[PDB]
């Protein structure tokens, strides 16, 4: 009875893994293209000057 | 005091036999309704699995 529990909830952690980790990979993707354009738009000796 | 010895022992031994006959029923019912209820969750469980 119990080891069918955790075998079912098992196979569900590890796609609930991969709903994670994918959350977690394209939201920061995004987090750093966008850091990407954010750095590229100022200029190099800009960002110095202004931080 | 034969007398009392067999009256005490049948005495004794009555009440005694008399709990162990009924724990032994008690015992063979409860191993038979382990398997029901046993059979009754792993098909529950089974189907709520699903």
Redesign the interface.
Same mark, same amino acid.
């Given at each position: 009875? #119990?080891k069918? #529990?955790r075998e079912?909830e098992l196979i569900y952690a590890r796609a609930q893994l991969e709903l994670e980790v994918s959350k977690a990979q394209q939201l920061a993707n995004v987090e750093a293209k966008k850091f990407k354009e954010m750095t590229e738009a100022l200029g190099p000796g800009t960002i110095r000057d202004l931080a | 005091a034969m007398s009392m010895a067999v009256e005490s022992t049948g005495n004794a031994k009555a009440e005694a036999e008399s709990r162990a006959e009924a724990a032994r029923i008690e015992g063979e019912g409860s191993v038979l309704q382990a398997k029901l209820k046993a059979q009754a969750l792993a098909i529950e469980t089974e189907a709520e699995l699903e």
């Open positions: 009875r #119990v069918k #529990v079912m | -």
